[PDB]
């Protein structure tokens, strides 16, 4: 049988330091900064899902489902990363499909949004459509400017 299992991180604190290492391998930040994001995971939004296996000795993939201030029936998927040595083996599509079903069936959401700088070909392949930019915050917002923001390509999938 299949040993693969997608689980919410708040039920598997044993996997938190491995998940921090996984995300920080792609986008280097402090361990504590990643822990703060994972510690916010709960049974509504936000929620971090990790792909693990029988024996939970490792973490293969991670993604975060985040609320959108202006869209009660939608969510923003962020920090999608598969372990490097496990890439190109279907695990990205696996955890994305699991998250899509989770949002539709468990959270009763209608749409998933995301942004990407250079992996829009992966999301287009698994059924995402390019769309106009959206914000997950309210209008009383100001964050430190970065040129990376205008590079992002926003995409959505009607569930």
């Amino acid at each position: 049988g299949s040993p693969f299992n997608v689980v919410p991180i708040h039920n598997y604190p044993e996997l938190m330091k491995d998940t921090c290492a996984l995300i920080n391998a792609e986008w280097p930040r402090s361990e504590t900064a990643r822990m703060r994001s994972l510690e916010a995971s709960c049974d509504s939004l936000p929620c971090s899902l990790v792909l693990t296996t029988e024996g939970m000795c490792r973490v293969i993939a991670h993604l975060k489902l985040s609320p959108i201030n202006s869209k009660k029936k939608a969510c923003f998927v962020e920090s999608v990363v598969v372990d490097k040595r496990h890439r190109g083996q279907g695990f990205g599509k696996l955890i994305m499909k699991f998250a899509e079903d989770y949002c539709r069936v468990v959270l009763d959401l209608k749409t998933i949004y995301l942004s990407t700088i250079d992996q829009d070909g992966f999301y287009e392949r698994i059924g995402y459509e390019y769309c106009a930019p959206i914000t997950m915050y309210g209008p009383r917002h100001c964050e430190l400017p970065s040129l990376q923001n205008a590079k992002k390509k926003y995409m959505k999938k009607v569930l």
Partner: peptide, 4 residues
């Protein structure tokens, strides 16, 4: 993209 990176959530933080």
């Amino acid at each position: 993209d990176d959530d933080i």
